[PDB]
């Protein structure tokens, strides 16, 4: 049987051969909306993950919230005290894969200090404030005694503690805040230690502040004990977060969230997962087709003979069933886009992704060629 409107496909021994149907195995479009029926999506408008974790005012509505995929937008900014995270990527990945913000308060001793300090660049409502999960400790009556607090872990899960160190602009500011000329912080458990010394110096002004805050994190195991022994420049914790192992991740995407059901999410939108390969983006979440760098890949009186037709249809549909539909789920993976210049690690990550993309493109081309060749061979053998 023949057709007036044909299609052109590629085999191993033939580069352009005319066939009848020639379905398509790569997806080149998306609906443009991040559907949220199977997974739980959290829209972080004007809010990064770290800002929500620390508790700046604009993200006040994100506290004690769980998620399966955090969506970060390009308009996200910070409207609180200037801060820097010495290992930003590691902390972002840790919190993103944990999949929950859940704060439980703890009662540290904190003898002879002034607690709950506020800044004029962190306005909550109509009054100056600070981060909602950190405690700015300042001198009281021009005295800052040493701290020796300790908290044990008698629970059945790891506890995450976020703390900080204040780097002031001048020595006068340091003395006016903490009585000692040079402070020093030592946070240790039974398995790790972290000693930090503040660095006094001027910085460009963000919201009329020349000083900064450096953010650090520790993890305490179910049989350990956290010890804090700082004598200056400490942004103390207010409690602990919960670390879980799950299927959560993070994603940067400027796409609207709608009411629909789909399983595969990319930064451009949610895409169907019937076909085995894709062409939209290399960043995926959930059960998603593989990424290839190709635009298209295509796979194949009077009477009738029912038996031969049924045999051919059965074999072709078996091949299609083996290919179309069965996908693999990858939840959290490495970063694929960078907005800075870093060095070795960034080059290594780019190399890994390029190698994977090239290998999978080769595999797709060879597989389509093989299947087309054998499909034509078997359909020629039945006649």
């Amino acid at each position, epitope marked *: 049987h023949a057709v007036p409107n044909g299609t052109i496909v590629k085999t191993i021994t033939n580069d352009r051969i005319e066939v009848t149907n020639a379905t398509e195995l790569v997806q080149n479009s998306s609906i443009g909306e991040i559907c949220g029926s199977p997974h739980q999506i959290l829209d972080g408008g004007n809010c990064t993950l770290i800002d929500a974790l620390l508790g700046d005012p604009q993200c006040d509505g994100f506290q004690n919230k769980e998620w399966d995929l955090f969506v970060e937008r390009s308009r996200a900014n910070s409207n609180c005290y200037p801060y820097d995270v010495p290992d930003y990527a590691s902390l972002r990945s840790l919190v993103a894969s944990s999949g929950t913000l859940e704060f*439980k*308060n703890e009662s540290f*001793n904190w003898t002879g200090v002034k607690q709950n300090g506020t800044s004029s660049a962190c306005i909550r409502g109509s009054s100056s404030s600070f981060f909602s999960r950190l405690n700015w400790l300042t001198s009281l009556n021009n005295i800052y005694p040493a701290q020796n607090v300790t908290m044990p872990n008698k629970e059945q899960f790891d506890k995450l503690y976020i703390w900080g160190v204040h780097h002031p602009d001048t020595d006068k500011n340091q003395i006016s805040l903490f009585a000692q000329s040079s402070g020093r912080i030592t946070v240790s458990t039974k398995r790790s230690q972290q000693a930090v010394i503040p660095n006094i110096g001027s910085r460009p002004r963000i919201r009329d502040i020349p000083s900064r805050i450096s953010i650090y994190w520790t993890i305490v195991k179910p049989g350990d004990i956290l010890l804090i022994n700082s004598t200056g420049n400490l942004i103390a914790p207010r409690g602990y977060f919960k670390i879980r192992s799950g299927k959560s991740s993070i994603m940067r995407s400027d796409a609207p969230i709608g009411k629909c059901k789909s399983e595969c999410i990319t930064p451009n939108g949610s895409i169907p997962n019937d076909k085995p390969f894709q062409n939209v983006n290399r960043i995926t979440y959930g059960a998603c087709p593989r990424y290839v760098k190709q635009s298209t890949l295509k796979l194949a009186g009077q009477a009738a003979d029912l038996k031969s037709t049924q045999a051919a249809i059965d074999q072709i549909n078996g091949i299609l069933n083996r290919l179309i539909g069965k996908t693999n789920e990858k939840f959290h993976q490495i970063e694929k886009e960078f907005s800075e210049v870093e060095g070795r690690v960034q080059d290594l990550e780019k190399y890994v992704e390029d190698t994977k993309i090239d290998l999978w493109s080769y595999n797709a081309e060879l597989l389509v060629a093989l299947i087309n060749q054998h499909t034509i061979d078997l359909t020629d053998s039945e006649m």
Partner: antibody
Framework: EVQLVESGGGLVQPGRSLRLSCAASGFTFHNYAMHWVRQAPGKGLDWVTGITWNSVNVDYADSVKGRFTISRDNAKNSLYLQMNSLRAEDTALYYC??????????????????WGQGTTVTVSG | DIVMTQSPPSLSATVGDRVTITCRASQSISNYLNWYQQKPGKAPKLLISGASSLQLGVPSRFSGSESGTDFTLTISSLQPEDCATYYCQQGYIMPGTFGQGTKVDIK
């Protein structure tokens, strides 16, 4: 000295109104949520109403859903409760309690860390 | 909504003995359980929040634990000052629900 002082209790007839006021002294008022908890004479403890620092999320109990109003004044450091229609099941001692989480947006994930010696409300003929 | 049940309605112990109070919940609360102690004629005072975080000023003989699915408050060395009614409260979902108290006496 951190304390909460209540005023406005008394004896009222059924179907009439009352207004209790709670004044807070010794802590920053615009950082903590505030609730009302009533105790019957010789019985357990019951939750009534709750408000946040921004007066955005306000929650009520089922039995006092329609005829009870809770309000806050941050400038004057006050928490007000207004009861419109009163029945005989509301004769109790009322406590004006404060929350533990610093600058909490919601009323849920916290505990009552400070309580005030409440006032008596009697609804009888 | 969520009903809280306390195991012993009344307990008697000698000075120096070990006392345990148990609380159970109908649904799952993510360890958001608080223990309150009320003496006769006074306002309740919060003992432990989060089932394991002692508040400042509370003596160290009070401990809290999660024994799988039950919440336990333990007094190691009971004293005459520890005669009161103890309540367990949730914080997960409003409305807050208090369980019926446990009354403790000294022999």
């Amino acid at each position: 000295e951190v304390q909460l002082v209540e005023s406005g209790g008394g004896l009222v007839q059924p179907g009439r109104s009352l207004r209790l006021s709670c004044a807070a002294s010794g802590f920053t008022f615009h950082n903590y949520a505030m609730h009302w908890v009533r105790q019957a004479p010789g019985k357990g403890l019951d939750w009534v109403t709750g408000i946040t620092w921004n007066s955005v999320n306000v929650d009520y109990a089922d039995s006092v859903k329609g005829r009870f109003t809770i309000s806050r004044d941050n400038a004057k450091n006050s928490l007000y409760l207004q009861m419109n229609s009163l029945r005989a099941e509301d004769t109790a001692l009322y406590y004006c309690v404060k929350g533990q989480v610093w600058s909490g947006y919601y009323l849920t994930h916290d505990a009552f860390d400070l309580w005030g010696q409440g006032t008596t409300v009697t609804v009888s003929g | 909504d969520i009903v809280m049940t306390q195991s012993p309605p009344s307990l008697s112990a000698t000075v120096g003995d070990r006392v345990t109070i148990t609380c159970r919940a109908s649904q799952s609360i993510s360890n958001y359980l608080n223990w309150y102690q009320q003496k006769p004629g006074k306002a309740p005072k919060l003992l432990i929040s989060g089932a394991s975080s002692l508040q400042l000023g509370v003596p160290s003989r009070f401990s809290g634990s999660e024994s799988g699915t039950d919440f336990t408050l333990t007094i190691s060395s009971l004293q005459p000052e520890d005669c009161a009614t103890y309540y367990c409260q949730q914080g997960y979902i409003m409305p807050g629900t208090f369980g019926q108290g446990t009354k403790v006496d000294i022999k």
